[PDB]
Every structure is written in C-alpha cells, then in structure tokens.
Design an enzyme around this catalytic site. Structure first.
Site, PDB file in Angstrom:
ATOM      1  N   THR F   1      15.831  91.353  20.848  1.00 24.88           N
ATOM      2  CA  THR F   1      16.330  91.397  22.249  1.00 24.88           C
ATOM      3  C   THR F   1      17.833  91.634  22.258  1.00 24.88           C
ATOM      4  OG1 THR F   1      16.079  90.339  24.426  1.00 24.88           O
ATOM      5  CG2 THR F   1      16.955  88.951  22.653  1.00 24.88           C
ATOM      6  N   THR F   2      18.304  92.311  23.300  1.00 26.67           N
ATOM      7  CA  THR F   2      19.716  92.589  23.490  1.00 26.67           C
ATOM      8  C   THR F   2      20.071  92.243  24.920  1.00 26.67           C
ATOM      9  OG1 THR F   2      19.485  94.457  21.972  1.00 26.67           O
ATOM     10  CG2 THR F   2      21.583  94.258  23.194  1.00 26.67           C
ATOM     11  N   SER F 130      19.478  89.962  19.152  1.00 25.97           N
ATOM     12  CA  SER F 130      19.281  90.426  17.786  1.00 25.97           C
ATOM     13  C   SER F 130      19.607  91.902  17.627  1.00 25.97           C
ATOM     14  CB  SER F 130      17.843  90.154  17.336  1.00 25.97           C
ATOM     15  OG  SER F 130      16.908  90.628  18.287  1.00 25.97           O
TER      16      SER F 130
END
Ligand SMILES: Nc1ncnc2c1ncn2[C@@H]1O[C@H](COP(=O)(O)OP(=O)(O)OP(=O)(O)O)[C@@H](O)[C@H]1O
Ligand SMILES: [Mg+2]
Lengths: 146, 233, 241, 69, 244, 199, 49, 97, 48
Positions: F1-2, F130
C-alpha cells in the site's frame, strides 16, 4: 410565627407580637417615637419583624479585632492604678475571639490577682495571668508533651 | 471522593420486624394498581398507566416490559427503582442463556431477581427497592405468574393485584376467578378489576396490557386494547 | 438541627448548607480584584500585614497555575494552595496529551468540576476558596474566569472576592475597560484597592499586581518593581484629592 | 340553572377534570364566572368565562404531586 | 403515619413511615432555587427550547452565562437548577453520548441518552452516601424515525417524553398555558413553534422580551444540527409577535 | 500500500490506493484508506490493517469528545498528538504508519507524519506505506514549493500511479481527497483516468 | 370589583343571575402593600369602614 | 363562600419597581436621578417597602456629606446596602393560601 | 415552639443580670453538672 401544627403551637406570644407589628405600621405610622431593638440571634426572628418599616438600618457588631481590644482594655484600666509597664499592644494580640465582655473581665481579674499578691499596682504579669483565668480553659495537668 | 458506607440501614427492632421493608411495602401500596390473572393458556398483566396532563407522550415509556422472549414485568411503586430491576433481570436472563443455550425458565428468573432485592436489605448503605414485580411467563407447556416483594420473598399466584386498593382487588378476583378461563377476559376480567380501583374513563392509551401465551410474551398494541375495551370482549 | 452536619443533606428549604458556610469563610478574607482589558489581564490583591515579622512580599496569594495563567485567590489560604496544585497538574496532562497550552475556557471548567465533586459526599469538606484564573493568548484574547466553593465558573470583565466584594464591584462598574491598554489599567487597579481598603479595620497593606497580556508576550509575571511604585503614587494622589 | 347559561356549557368537562371539591367551591365557580361577565359587560356568561372561573378558584387549590411513584 | 420521622430519614435517603423519600422531595426544591425558567415545545418538524437569560451585572460576560449546551451535534439540552450540579451533569451527558458512538457506531438516540442520565441519578437516590444532584435536564433532538422529540429527566430518575414542558420557578403556571395550545392543535410549522414558546414564557413572567433576555435553541428536521439562535435571528420573531 | 499527502495553500491533498494484501492473496481490492477522523482531518492508514483501525477509532473517540468540550473545530496538530501518544505507548504491540493531514482554521493545511516508531514530524508532503519506497526520487524532483489545488491532484495521481506499477502490494483504484476550507472533494480514478508511464 | 361595583349597582348581577361575592383575602410576602392597599380603599369608597 | 377571593399580591416586577421608585423618589430634591434602569435591575427581591428604604438611604448619604440634594451614586450605594441586609436578614418564604 | 416557654424564662434571668439594670450588689452561684448546655449569652464574663 411559623408554628401551625394541629395539636400544639403556643399561639400566645405570637398575638402580642402582632400587636407590636401594628404599632410600627398600619393606622398612623409612628413618626415621633424611634425604636432601637437589640437581639443576639437575629436568625430566629420572623421576617415580618425585619424588612423596612420596622427595623430599617441594621447595625452588625463584629466582635472586636486587635486594635479595638487594646482600646477596650485601656478603657476599664483607667479606674485603677496600673504601672507604666503594661503593654496593651501585646495583651490585645495575646487574646483572641474575646468580646468586650471578656476584655472587661481581664482587667477585673488582673486587679483580683494584684489583690491576692498583696500589691497596689497592676504589672504586665498580672494581666497575663488574668487572661489565663478569664479565658475558658479546663484543668489540663498533662500539658507536658511539648 | 468517597468510600461508601458499610453498615446496613435495615435493622431489627425490639418487635422482631425489619422496619425498612415494612415501609417499602407502604410505598408499594401507593403505586398504580396492577392486576395479574393466570388463564389456562396465557397470562394477562394489566396496569393503570401514569399521566397527569395531555402533554405527556403516552408511548415514550412502558410499565409493561419484556424481559425475554417468554417473560414480562409490571410493577407498582417507584418508577426509577423499576428501571434498575428490569435491567438486572435482562442481564440475568442473558447469563443464563449464554451458559445453557436455553431460555431461562420463569421459576428461575423470579428466584434470582428476588435475590438481588434481598441483597439490598443486608448490604451497606442502601435502602430496599420500592417496587413489587409481577412476573409472567409461559415455559414447558404451562403459564406462570409470580410476584416478588421488596422483602425478597416470592409467591406463585393464580391471580392477584398489587398497588393501590390491592385489598379490594384481591377480593374482587377471589370470586370472579374460576379456573379454565380462556386467555381473552383475563384481559376482560383483568380490565374489570382495574376499574374497581380506577377513577375516570379508560382508553387505549391510558392502560397497558400484556399477554403471554405459548407464542411468546408481547405488549398489546393500542389498537388491540381499544377493542377489549368494548367492555364486552 | 441536623442539616448542616453533612454536605450530603439537602435542607427542607432546598439548599445545601455546608456550601453556604464555605462561601462565608471566603467573605471573611482580604479582597482580591481582577479586571480584564482588551489586551491583557491585571490582578490585584489587598494583602494585609498582620505583623512586622512576616517577610515582605512573601507568602503571596498570586500563583502561577501555568506559564500563561494567573491564579489570584481569596479565602482560607491552605485550601487555595491545594487547588493551585490540582490545576498545575491538569494543565500538564493537557499539554501532554493534546500538545499545546491549555485553553483557559477549559482549564476553568475542569477546576470547577473538581471543586464540585467535593460538595456531593459526606466523606469530604467543600473547599473554602474562591479564586480567579486569568490568561492571555493571541488566538483568544484575554479571558478572566472566577470560580467559587459551589463549583461555579463564570466569565467576567471584572470581579472581586473577599470581605470588600461589594465596595470593589462598584469601582469597576464605574470604569471603562474595553478600550484601555494594559498599561493604563494597572494605575486603575492600585487606585481601586486603596479605596476599598479600611485602615480603621486593618493595619496596613502590601499591594500585589500581575500582568498577563500583550506586554509580556503571553506570559504571566508579577508587575516589575518600578511600575508598581508608579501605581502606588498615583493612588495616594486620588485619596488626597 | 338559576343563572344564564351558554349555548354550550359542557358542564361535563368541569365535572370530570378535578377530583375533589366541595358544594361550596362549585357555588363559588359560578359566582366567579358570572362575575367575569360583569367585567365584560355581557348579559350572559360564555364558555371562556366559565373556564377561567374554574382555574381561578379550583386549579389554584391543585398543587404539585411527585411524578415518580 | 402522616409525615412522622423514623429518626434518620430526612438526613439520608431511606423510606419514611409514610412511604416516601423526603430527601428527593427536597432535591426538587433546588430546581426552583435557580430562579430561571425554561420552556420546550415540540412541533411536527422541529423542537424549540427557549430560556430566560438573566445577566445580573454589567461585569459578567454575556456569552458565558448560557444554559443551552451542545451534547452531540444532534442533541441540545437546557439545564435548570444549581448551576454547579448542572454543568456536572452536562459533562456526564457528553461522555455517554460519545461513549455510545464509540461502542455501537451510530450516534446515540435522544431516547437512550436520557435513560442513562436518569439511571445515574437513580443511584444517588438509592445510596445514603451522597445527595442527588439538584438540577433537571431537558433534551431535544431529531430522531431518525419518530420525528423530533423532547425528554425531561428529574433528580429522582423518572424521565418522560413530552410535547411541551417547562421546568423551574413557573413550572405549574406554564404547563397550564401550554396544554391549551396543544388540545386546539395547529400545523406546528417552524414559525408556529417558536411563536408558542416565546409567548408562553413572555406571558407567564410578563416580561415581553428584548432579544438579549432569551436564548433560543432549536433543531429542525431539514437541518438536524443543534443551533443556538443569535440575537439577530431572535429579534425577527419578537417583532413578528408584536405585530400579530 | 502507498499513501500520500501534499500541502498547498488552501488545504491538503490526500491520496491512497486500495489493496489489502494478505501475503500474495489480495483480500479486498477496493479498500478505503482515507479515514475521516473529524470534519476536515484525515488519516491514511498503512501497515497492519487491524492495528490502524483500532487506533483510528480510538482517536476519533477522544478527538470528537474533545471538540465538543471546547466548542471549537479541533486543530490538526491536536489529532496528530493523539496518534503520537497512542502509537508510542503501544509501540510493542502495534505497527502503524499514519499520515494525519487536514485543514485548520488557524494554521492552514498541514501534514503530519507518524511512522512506525511513534515519532511525529510535520512535512510539506509526506509519503508512506510499503510501495512508498519506489517513488522517493520522482517525488523529490517533481515537487516545487507553491502549487495550486489543480497541480496537486495531478501530482499525487502520477506518484501513486508509479508506485502501483512497481509495488506488488499496491494496485486497484486511486482515492484522492482535497481538503480545503470549503469542504472535502473526494474522487476516484479508475481505468484510464489513472496516469500511465509504460515504456 | 368586589367592594365598590356590587355595592353601587347590585342589579348587574341579578341580570347575570348570580349574587355578588362576600369577602376578599389580601395575602402575600411582607412589605408588598397589603395594608397600604386597604388604606387606599378607606380614603375613597365613602361609606362606613 | 366564606372568603370568595384569593388576591395574591406579589413581589414587584420590572415595571412596578420603577413606578414605586418614581413615586418615592419624586419628593427628593436632586440634580437628575438618571439611571433608574440599573436601580431596577439591581433591586430584585425588593418589596414595595424596601424600595421606600432605598430612597431614604440615598437621602442619608446626602445628609452625611452635608449636601442639600442627592445624586445618582446615592441611589446606587443605597441599593447595594439595603440589598446586603435584605438578603442577610432572614429568608422570606411564599405562603400560599 | 420547642421549649419556647422555658427558653423565655431564661431570657428573663439573662436580662436581669446584664440588661440596663445596674442592680444592687448581689452575688450569684450557679451549680450545674452539664455546662455544655448553657446558652453562650448566659455564660460569658460579666454575668458569670
Ligand atoms: N406596592 C407599593 N407601592 C408603593 N409603596 C409601597 C408599596 N408597598 C409598600 N409600600 C411602602 O411601604 C410602606 C409599608 O408597606 P405596607 O405596610 O403596605 O406593607 P404590608 O404588606 O402592610 O406589610 P405586612 O405584610 O408586614 O403587613 C408603605 O407606607 C408604603 O409607602
Ligand atoms: Mg400590613
């Protein structure tokens, strides 16, 4: 006049009280006869006997402070012979919670201790033992835990 | 803040009485009349609702509460003390239902609710509860009607009254109660024996009725009560 | 009879008597005035010297409750120092968890709510202590609150507490104050004190003063010595005249 | 019946409402309501006069009863 | 019987020989000690609170004397009684409301947030250790499936749902004025309601207000946020009630 | 995920992507990682999915209680300090990358990063998750002080679009949110609206 | 309305069909003018008092 | 029937306090008692007679200072004085019939 | 009116050892065993 229960009541002092309340108001208001009333438990009075029209200006007496006591003791000493030793400034601070009636009693008691000792002058030491006397104080003979 | 008192306020007197419970029973007898009538296939719990203007909203509170799918209460006496017992009962029922996966029998629930009320005549710094609960329920094929007192006792009845004029109502019921009634009078006959103690005109929003048959306890909708109030049903 | 032995007892009248009495213990203390202007708050205590043996300007009645919040008290002084520590402790837990100086509107409601918890039980005695919290911020202006034994807080533009509560509230009603710079108020405070004090009921007095406003950059100090003298000279002159 | 009536008195409203008054209180109601007509310079009484007359002397005597029992 | 004393029974909260709790019949007399009165009227779209605001001095700020408190965003309420107890119970309401949202995730109904203020009060009745609070909360707020609503909870616990209530000094006098305007029945628009509330308070006290002598809290179905009307909006209704 | 938050003058621009991996199986492909903490303060949850949810809820509980007691719209720096207190006490149990950013009525838009440890620091643009690793250049070259709301909503789109091509734990749709004094303008980019950089 | 009016024009009450009231009670907190009120009545009504 | 009317004479109101003050204050020589609105606002709990006191007290400060007239402070002080003793001096209860 | 009768008699005793009444020259003994009960205005110096 707050009583009202149906069995007891008194209802006798109360009536002759309501007579007093119609000599201060009603009819012609009395303007040629002033009324000074003194009590020492103003809290148990009937509201109808305070407010305006009856007791108007209500002077409270505050129990003397330090400076007043000094003038109150010095007022009852003048009648008798006191040394110039006495220091009313100190005595006043020594007493506390005293009334005009107790300060008065001090001087009375000092003179009574000078009568026993066999002198004719009050010294600063007599007043000190009078304060110990006219001040309520039980016989506490265990006061040896300092 | 505080610690709390530790010493019971209910105490024996030279008589052999617990004066506090004697008084809390007099509060009970100030409360709104309530009748209970076990039928032969249902239980009827009817009660004189409280109001004293037209401003109150007579559907925001209920004197006939459901405790479980198969239990009910009405009360007679102090209204705050009733919301406390209704709420300790609903939790008792849920601990019982959480351990046996089975709806709590009605003999059981009254015997526990009573032991909470018994705890407040022997605990520190409290007064007894000010209510009498009338607990109906229908389990195991039968109906049940109990009544717990602020003392803590409880008695099974076949029909009873509590609250105001509960000596006139227990007499009135003593004659009119002949077993083997249908469920629908106990309603009729119940409503009648509220009327033997009620001054005014009864309406659909002025009394509250609750029945309790095999299908489960349920409060009667306002419409439903208006019909039994044909005084003929 | 038996309606005064407990804070937990209403009287038939309708009022808790133990709180009434507490408030009367305040009325038998020296006078403290607060007066909020448009860019600060100034505090004024009428501290009596009861002997020449107490050291000068010591055992104050002006606490710092936080780095931008004065507290001037009246009433029984022991219980005052107790509140001043409960308040410091609250205004620290607030900077800890929320990370910024506590707003005085809230610090007040929290110190009142703590006083109130002491009028409910019989196991404790209601505080004998009324007191004012002042404060300045650049996002809220000056605010001045006053608490009392009851546990009541009220916003104020001025107020007073103590034995001359009546005479001093007059002097502030006869004073414009939504328009004066901080610097001009301090002169007024001194003058008001001198008027409301009786030297025929008390010996003498020391005049205690506190900024908290635009002058000091949102801190709370005690007025510097030089400005305090100027306020005492301008106050003897208004009693001469 | 000895005094003038309204077209609609609805005395049944004033019989239901309260729940304790005397044969004198009642006689005082009617005296009051009529006496409101004399203020209003109206020959007969009206359905409003007889409602204020009932609140004047009856509802006055009806106080507060605690609503949590 | 007939009022006798059981020794202790007017000093703690235990039953009298009659069957009453003298200690709670006293805590009601505290509500009237305040000296304020508050009316609350339910419409068919909105519920209104109107409170007498009494600023005794020119010193007190006028924006921090209020009796209207925001409990949620959809629940206002008005506090009458001892101001200390009041604020102590408002603080406790807000706590429950936000504790409710935290545990169930759909903000609290006005029904239940009274039922909990009621039950906290009830404990103070049943123990001897403390007195009951001497105040009386009236909550208002729009329910998602029953329209607007008004609840009032007393020092003893007993709380109920209303169409119009008051509390405080003229609590008897008001409910006689209101029940007449309820058995007639109107449309009860937003302007109808505010009209009935102010004219009830204004006639039972005889004031005929200035916009600065009442504060008016109101909650409409179109906009369910609890507003407190400023002096500008309050005056629009006062000169409209002077015309009519 | 960002997750990504940028600061312009009116307010802030949040941007996340939707994909909760559980190893190499994707559990929910349209997840909402822009959680409202209040009316104009958003948090971006990354790291352990169950830990963040608990913390977020717990801060809403305190922050909303806290704003009604002051009657003021809470500050962004406040709702930061509450995540800070939370993530530091339980820095053993948890593992929560947060990014609080919202619009304040008295400090502008703000962005606060709160990384795994419970540190707290204000930043012009922050960036976490991540997949954040893969876009520290692009985001360091392309950002220039001073932008408009229309240069930011295209900036984060491009960033989160690069971070989804390369990371495996990112994908799906992009969720942006512009927070201004006005209100909150939530939009979703999907299909072709997602910028493309294939070469 | 209970002292003067039906002491002058009793007929107004026979037309309604009632009888005028007999007696008023002034009551209320002290100092509020209960005696002054009767003082005012006595100055004016003009009859035995 | 025995007593037909229950006239409740209540404590004065806002208009009322004003009228009574104006009735009493009239005979006092002055230079313009202009602040009646603060006087009415402070004089809560004042019964007809206690406003009669206020107007006298305001007179007494004048006789003490040795003026031949009162001022707007004389009536401001008098309301504070009377109002202190009125509250101190015992609580008045409403007695309904 | 609890003890309102007896109480008033005491006020008369109080009043004649402290009122205006200078009074001749008469001494006064009072032997209680429960001094805790005596009224303060009966107890303070100048009357006892
Ligand atoms: N309502 C009023 N208007 C004008 N003056 C008043 C009023 N009430 C009282 N006063 C003044 O106060 C004086 C005394 O009041 P008054 O004796 O009428 O009270 P009261 O009700 O008779 O008292 P109580 O209840 O003790 O008999 C009067 O002489 C009058 O000047
Ligand atoms: Mg009189």
């Amino acid at each position: 006049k707050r009583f009202d229960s149906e069995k007891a009541g008194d209802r006798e002092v109360q009536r002759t009280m309501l007579e007093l309340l119609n000599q201060l108001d009603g009819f012609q208001p009395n303007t040629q006869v002033k009324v000074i009333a003194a009590t020492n438990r103003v809290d148990i009075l009937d509201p109808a006997l305070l407010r305006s029209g009856r007791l108007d200006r209500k002077i409270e007496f505050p129990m003397p402070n330090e400076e007043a006591r000094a003038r109150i003791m010095q007022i009852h000493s003048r009648k008798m012979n006191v040394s110039p030793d006495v220091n009313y400034e100190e005595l006043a601070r020594c007493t506390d919670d005293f009334n005009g009636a107790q300060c008065k009693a001090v001087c009375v008691e000092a003179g009574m201790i000078a009568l026993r000792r066999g002198a004719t002058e009050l010294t600063h030491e007599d007043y000190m033992e009078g304060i110990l006397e006219v001040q309520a104080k039980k016989k506490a003979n265990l006061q040896y835990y300092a | 803040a505080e610690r709390g008192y530790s010493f019971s306020l209910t105490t024996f007197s030279p008589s052999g009485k617990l004066v506090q419970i004697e008084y809390a029973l007099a509060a009970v007898a100030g409360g709104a009349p309530s009748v209970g009538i076990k039928a032969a296939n249902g239980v009827v719990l009817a009660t004189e609702k409280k109001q004293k203007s037209i401003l109150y909203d007579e559907r925001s509170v209920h004197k006939v509460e459901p405790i479980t799918k198969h239990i009910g209460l009405v009360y007679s006496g102090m209204g705050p003390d009733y919301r406390v017992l209704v709420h300790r009962a609903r939790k008792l029922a849920q601990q019982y239902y959480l351990v046996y996966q089975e709806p709590i029998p009605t003999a059981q629930l009254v015997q526990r609710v009573a032991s909470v009320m018994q705890e407040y005549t022997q605990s520190g710094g409290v007064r007894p509860f000010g209510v009498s609960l009338l607990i109906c329920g229908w389990n195991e094929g039968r109906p049940y009607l109990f009544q717990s007192d602020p003392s803590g006792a409880y008695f099974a009845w076949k029909a009873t009254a509590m609250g105001k004029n509960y000596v006139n109502g227990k007499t009135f019921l003593e004659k009119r109660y002949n077993e083997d009634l249908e469920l629908e009078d106990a309603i009729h006959t119940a409503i009648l024996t509220l009327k033997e103690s009620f001054e005014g005109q009864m309406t659909e929003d002025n009394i509250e009725v609750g029945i309790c048959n095999e299908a489960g306890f349920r409060r009667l909708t306002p419409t439903e009560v208006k019909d039994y109030l044909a005084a003929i049903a | 009879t038996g309606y005064d032995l407990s804070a937990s007892t209403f009287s038939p009248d309708g009022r808790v008597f133990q709180v009434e009495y507490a408030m009367k213990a305040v009325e038998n203390s020296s006078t403290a005035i607060g007066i909020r202007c448009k860019d600060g708050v100034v505090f004024g205590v009428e501290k009596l010297v009861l002997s020449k043996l107490y050291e000068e300007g010591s055992n104050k009645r002006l606490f710092n409750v936080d780095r931008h919040v004065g507290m001037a008290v009246a009433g029984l002084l022991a219980d005052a120092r107790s509140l001043a520590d409960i308040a410091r402790e609250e205004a620290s837990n607030f900077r800890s968890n929320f990370g910024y100086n506590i707003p005085l509107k809230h610090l007040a409601d929290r110190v009142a709510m703590y006083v109130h918890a002491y009028t409910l039980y019989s196991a404790v005695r209601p505080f004998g202590c009324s007191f004012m919290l002042g404060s300045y911020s650049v996002n809220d202006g000056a605010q001045l609150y006053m608490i009392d034994p009851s546990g009541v807080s009220y916003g104020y533009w001025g107020c007073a507490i103590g034995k001359a509560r009546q005479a001093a509230k007059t002097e502030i009603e006869k004073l414009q104050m939504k328009e004066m710079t901080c610097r001009d108020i301090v002169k007024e405070v001194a003058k008001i004190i001198y008027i409301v004090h009786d030297e025929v009921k008390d010996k003498a007095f020391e005049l205690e003063l506190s900024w908290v406003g635009e002058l000091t950059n949102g801190r709370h100090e005690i007025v510097p010595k030089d400005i305090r003298e100027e306020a005492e000279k301008y106050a003897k002159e208004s009693l001469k005249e | 019946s000895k005094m003038n009536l309204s077209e609609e008195v609805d005395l049944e409203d004033y019989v239901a409402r309260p729940d304790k008054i005397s044969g004198a209180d009642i006689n005082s109601i009617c005296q009051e309501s009529g006496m409101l007509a004399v203020r209003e310079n109206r020959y007969i009484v009206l359905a409003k006069d007889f409602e204020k007359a009932y609140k004047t002397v009856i509802k006055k005597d009806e106080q507060e009863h605690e609503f949590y029992k | 019987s007939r009022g006798s004393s059981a020794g202790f029974d007017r000093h703690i909260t235990i039953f009298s020989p009659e069957g009453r709790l003298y200690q709670v019949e006293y805590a009601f007399k505290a509500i009237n000690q305040g000296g304020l009165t508050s009316v609350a009227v339910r419409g068919k779209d909105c519920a209104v609170i109107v409170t007498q605001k009494k600023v005794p001095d020119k010193l007190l700020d006028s924006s921090t004397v209020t009796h209207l408190f925001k409990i949620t965003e959809n629940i206002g309420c008005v506090m009458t009684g001892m101001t200390a107890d009041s604020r102590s119970q408002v603080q406790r309401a807000r706590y429950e409301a936000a504790n409710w949202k935290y545990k169930y995730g759909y903000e609290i109904p006005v029904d239940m947030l009274c039922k909990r203020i009621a039950d906290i009060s009830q404990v103070y009745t049943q123990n001897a250790e403390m007195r009951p609070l001497g105040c009386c909360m009236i909550l208002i707020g729009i329910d998602e499936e029953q329209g607007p609503q008004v609840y009032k909870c007393d020092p003893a616990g007993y709380y109920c749902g209303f169409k119009a209530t008051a509390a405080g000094v003229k609590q008897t006098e008001s409910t006689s004025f209101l029940e007449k305007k309820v058995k007639k029945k109107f449309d009860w628009t937003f302007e109808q309601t505010v009209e009935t509330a102010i004219t009830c308070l204004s006639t039972v006290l005889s004031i005929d207000f200035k916009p600065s002598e009442i504060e008016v809290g109101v909650v409409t179905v179109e906009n369910p946020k609890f507003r407190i009307l400023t002096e500008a909006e309050i005056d629009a209704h006062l000169v409209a009630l002077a015309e009519r | 995920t960002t997750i990504m938050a940028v600061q312009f003058d009116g307010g802030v621009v949040l941007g996340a992507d939707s994909r909760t991996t559980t190893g190499s199986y994707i559990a929910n492909r349209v997840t909402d990682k822009l959680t409202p903490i209040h009316d104009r303060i958003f948090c971006c949850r990354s790291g352990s999915a169950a830990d963040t949810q608990a913390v977020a809820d717990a801060v809403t509980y305190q922050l909303g209680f806290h704003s009604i007691e002051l009657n003021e719209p809470p500050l962004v720096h406040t709702a930061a300090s509450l995540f800070k207190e939370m993530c530091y006490r339980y820095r053993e149990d948890l593992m929560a990358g947060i990014i609080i950013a919202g619009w304040d009525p008295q400090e502008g838009g703000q962005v606060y990063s709160v990384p795994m440890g419970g540190m707290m620091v204000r930043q012009s643009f922050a960036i976490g998750g991540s997949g954040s690793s893969y876009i520290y250049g692009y985001v360091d070259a392309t950002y220039r002080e001073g932008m408009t709301k229309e240069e930011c909503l295209q900036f984060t789109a491009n960033a989160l679009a690069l971070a989804m091509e390369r990371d495996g734990s990112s994908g799906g749709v992009i969720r942006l949110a512009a927070i201004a004094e006005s209100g909150v303008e939530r939009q979703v980019l999907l299909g072709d609206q997602i910028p493309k950089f294939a070469v | 309305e209970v002292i003067e009016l039906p002491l002058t024009n009793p007929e107004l009450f026979q037309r309604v069909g009632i009888i005028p009231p007999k007696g008023c009670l002034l009551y209320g907190p002290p100092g509020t003018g209960k005696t002054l009120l009767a003082r005012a009545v006595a100055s004016q009504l003009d009859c035995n008092f | 029937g025995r007593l037909d009317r229950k006239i409740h004479i209540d404590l004065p109101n806002e208009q009322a306090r004003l009228d009574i003050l104006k009735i009493h204050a009239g005979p006092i020589t002055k230079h313009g008692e202009i602040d009646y609105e603060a006087i009415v606002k402070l004089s809560d709990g004042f019964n007809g007679a206690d406003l009669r006191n206020v107007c006298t007290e305001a007179g007494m400060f004048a006789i003490r200072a040795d003026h031949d007239f009162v001022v707007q402070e004389d009536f401001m002080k008098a309301v504070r004085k009377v109002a202190d003793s009125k509250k101190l001096e015992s609580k008045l209860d409403y007695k309904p019939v | 009116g609890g003890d309102n009768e007896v109480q008033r008699t005491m006020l008369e005793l109080i009043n004649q050892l402290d009122g205006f009444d200078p009074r001749g020259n008469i001494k006064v003994l009072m032997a209680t065993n429960r001094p805790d009960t005596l009224d303060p205005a009966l107890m303070r110096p100048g009357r006892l």
